[PDB]
Amino acid sequence: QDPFPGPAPVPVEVVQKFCRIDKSRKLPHSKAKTRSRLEVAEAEEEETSIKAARSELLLAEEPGFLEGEDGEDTAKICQADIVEAVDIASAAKHFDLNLRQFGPYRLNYSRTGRHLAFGGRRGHVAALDWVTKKLMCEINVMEAVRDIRFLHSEALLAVAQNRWLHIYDNQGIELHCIRRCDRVTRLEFLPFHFLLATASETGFLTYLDVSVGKIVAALNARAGRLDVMSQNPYNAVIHLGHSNGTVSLWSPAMKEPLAKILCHRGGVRAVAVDSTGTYMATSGLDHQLKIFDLRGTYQPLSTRTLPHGAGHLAFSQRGLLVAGMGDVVNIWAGQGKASPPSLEQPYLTHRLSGPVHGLQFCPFEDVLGVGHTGGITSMLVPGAGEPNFDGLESNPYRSRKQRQEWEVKALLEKVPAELICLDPRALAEVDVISLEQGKKEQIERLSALDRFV
């Protein structure tokens, strides 16, 4: 007589999020011994997913939002209006450092969103905590600087100087000067492999294992100057743009690109892919912004013609896309629930003091870092960052003992170079041809005068 008899139900959609079994296949099994194992496999998967569905209540934060009223357009809303209507905590995160004596700046946030490091064209190198306004180090290397990146924790950062590649501590003391990596223009770090991928002006892509200190691969792209590069965090492959209009997929194991994708009628100047690995964003000389579907189809989902050129691109963790055109930035936002960004009308606009030279989103905050000739600015972007973070993976609020314990766990785990492929789950599949080769060996052990002719 109790009005509701059953136990508490869980939403189907959240359960489907924690599922890794291909229900699509209709594989036949006519043996009971196979049947018992398969039913257990579904039972183990079903039980584990359900517990995670209930655990959604543990999540405590909510993503930001920004809507106009009475038909206001969000494009014309400026940063000054936002700072006044937002609390003192987030208002302190917006600041504009003005350093015009040195050249245009390239900025990189750490994987943990607490630290920021930047490098100047004329030779200014500095790393700082940006939440609190403290300066970790400030040095001036005599040569020009083309790129800067963090290596895993904030301790080490690699600077792409004029001649070779250099390694510095967080306190400014020089450690390594790698002469093999020469005239490199772009740098990017693979976190879970401890591989640093370098693109050089001479046309070579080089991989370095920062854990052991050995160069695993040095590949000749065979396309001339290399200036456009990005990685897919889900896929771990490297994308390389060329003046031909093609983007090449690379892995350290192969000596030839995994695939070539023709994206533009002219030269490509930017490439960026989302965290989930579903979409790619590219821009080129034909002033077209394109969104590509990386789940097997490789068709351009969205297209738009622009007055100026999108020099740089980036994605947040919620799916927002920002394009840096001249001295103006524009952010496109969409619902993102299994849909690409909608390029119909931009979400926010802002005009910088100088031309844009670098864009990147903070990992777990609603701010955007823009590097330009005038200096470095921090915008406020409501709805861009992921609200809830995992404590054992990336804590902004972590002590030293938490950090040094975490690093060894990642080092005990390090992925070999050759396992990088287009499918991150390719290790699950059985190698079909070796099955056939093995079966070959298994088989091996187991009228009247016409006759006179």
């Binding site: 109790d2 508490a8 209930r54 209540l57 543990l58 405590a60 404590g391």
Partner: protein, 567 residues
């Protein structure tokens, strides 16, 4: 870290989600509960542990249970008790077990656990809790008493409670409290069986099973008070009056030569015409007392009989008092009465306006104890009320009798009488003799009354001469200097220089410890019309250095209280 905490929160999730399904609690309430539960969980999983954290956790869970219980009745939903209520109860039981394991020595935590088990837990859990308590805390008979009490009044099991009592006696063979409660317990068992027969073995129904305890307990504990104590519980039970009769008869025969037994027989006999009816009862009780006197002539027996007569007097009055003198004279002649009871009768007589018997008690006391000065004071108060002209004789006799020099109340009393009915020169003569006799700390009160007399008998000039002589006899008090300053204020002159001169002397003696004296000095410079308030800067500076320890803090607070209007 939060591995165990996360396990516990995911264990706590299903009942919260069911509560959401009920409609009892809204989703925001569930979020707040999860937040506070995580905050409290982080407290009790640390490497450093405190009892306050366990108590806070238990209190939060109890408050949540009460809130749920209140809301269910309003909603009217009574299903799914097991999913929520029992889950919370097991979690609280685990917390209590861990806390009790950490702190075995704390009985108060054990009693909190017992109370929670009574309120919310199954009776078998409470049985296990009592067993665990009695395992390590067997040396406290009160715990055995509570454990046995729970069996009878709650579980209604008389036999199980008997074994808990019987085992308790082997651990504590000499505790009288265990015997009395066990004696009471069996008589309770008799009442249950008597009502049992009415609703529908003969020997137990008579109370024989309790009578066995009485004989054995008397043998182990050979005391008069204990045997009388067992009777008190026996009278409380109406049934089996023979049991009360049997024990009462044994009181006289077995217990003799002790005053308490004879007294109890007397008070039992105690238990306008009705006033006469009271009268013969008092005589019958008295006759018992003399029968005890010839059998037992010890001193202790007498006082119970004088105190009996004293109580009847204070509570017709003439007949009661006529008893008092006759028993007083009889006790006095055998000299057994002690000093203290002489005073008690004497003061009672004074309050009832009877001034001829009080003299007899006073005179009788002095001849027995000539050295005792307190009864000498008692005699003096009698003659003052009597107004007899023998006051002068009394002081001469007392001081000759009092060989020790220190008789402080006598010295004061002589000063009081001499002022009333003697010349002023003799009063000064008495005071000067007193200051010679007493040289130590007792002179403090002597000097204060000397100065007060000087202002009354003389004027301001006379007080000045007395103050000048005594300003060097070092044992002092602050009342000596407060009196002198007060006399200066009342005079019309109010020489402000003399005001400072007295305060400096007072601050020289008691400045190290007296915060109030420094405060009073500062207000004089302000409020007095002749004062110089520009000295207040220096007095505060001087006050800080001489004051030591806690007095330094009090002066600061009082002055800060003085700057505000609260004073």
């Amino acid at each position: 870290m939060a591995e165990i905490i996360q396990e516990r929160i995911e264990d706590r999730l299903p009942e919260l989600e069911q509560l959401e399904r009920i409609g009892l609690f809204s989703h925001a309430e569930i979020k707040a509960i999860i937040k506070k539960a995580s905050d409290l969980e982080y407290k009790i999983q640390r490497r450093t542990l405190f009892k306050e954290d366990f108590i806070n956790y238990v209190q939060y869970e109890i408050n949540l249970l009460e809130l749920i219980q209140r809301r269910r009745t309003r909603i009217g939903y009574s299903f799914k008790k097991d999913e929520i209520e029992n889950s919370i109860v097991h979690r609280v039981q685990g917390v209590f077990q861990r806390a009790s394991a950490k702190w075995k020595d704390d009985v108060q935590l054990w009693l909190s656990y017992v109370a929670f088990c009574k309120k919310w837990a199954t009776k078998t859990r409470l049985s296990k809790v009592f067993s665990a308590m009695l395992a390590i805390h067997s040396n406290k008979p009160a715990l055995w008493i509570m454990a046995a009490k729970w069996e009878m009044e709650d579980r209604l099991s008389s036999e199980s409670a008997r074994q808990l009592f019987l085992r308790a006696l082997r651990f504590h063979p000499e505790c009288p409290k265990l015997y009395k409660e066990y004696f009471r317990m069996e008589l309770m068992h008799a009442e249950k069986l008597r009502k049992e027969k009415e609703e529908f073995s003969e020997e137990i129904l008579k109370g024989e099973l309790a009578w066995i305890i009485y004989k054995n307990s008397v043998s182990i504990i050979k005391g008069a008070e204990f045997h009388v104590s067992l009777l008190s519980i026996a009278q409380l039970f109406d049934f089996a009056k023979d049991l009360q009769k049997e024990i009462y008869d044994d009181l006289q025969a077995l217990h003799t030569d002790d005053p308490l037994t004879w007294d109890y027989v007397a008070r039992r006999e105690l238990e306008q015409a009705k006033a006469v009816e009271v009268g013969r009862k008092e005589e019958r009780c008295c006759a018992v007392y003399e029968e005890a006197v010839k059998t037992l002539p010890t001193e202790a027996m007498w006082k119970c009989y004088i105190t009996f007569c004293l109580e009847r007097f204070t509570k017709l009055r003439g007949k009661r008092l006529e008893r008092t003198m006759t028993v007083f004279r009889k006790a006095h002649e055998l000299k057994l009465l002690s000093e203290c009871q002489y005073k008690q009768l004497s003061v009672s007589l004074l309050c009832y306006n009877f001034l001829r018997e009080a003299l007899e008690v006073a005179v009788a006391g002095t001849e027995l104890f000539r050295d005792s000065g307190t009864m000498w004071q008692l005699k003096l108060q009698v003659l003052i009320e009597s107004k007899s002209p023998d006051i002068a004789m009394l002081f001469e006799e007392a001081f000759v009798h009092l060989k020790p020099q220190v008789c402080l109340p006598l010295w004061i009393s002589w000063a009081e009488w001499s002022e009333g009915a003697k010349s002023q020169e003799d009063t000064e003569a008495v005071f000067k003799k007193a200051l010679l006799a007493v040289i130590g700390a007792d002179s403090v009160t002597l000097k204060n009354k000397y100065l007060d007399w000087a202002y009354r008998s003389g004027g301001y000039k006379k007080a000045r001469a007395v103050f000048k002589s005594l300003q060097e006899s070092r044992p002092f008090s602050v009342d000596f200097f407060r009196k002198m300053i007060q006399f200066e204020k009342e005079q019309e002159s109010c020489n402000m220089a003399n005001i400072r001169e007295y305060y400096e002397r007072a601050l020289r003696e008691f400045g190290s410890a007296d915060s109030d004296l420094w405060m009073d000095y500062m207000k004089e410079e302000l409020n007095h019309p002749l004062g110089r308030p520009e000295n207040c800067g220096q007095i505060y500076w001087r006050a800080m250095k001489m004051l030591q320890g806690e007095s330094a803090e009090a002066f600061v607070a009082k002055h800060a209280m003085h700057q505000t209007g609260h004073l």
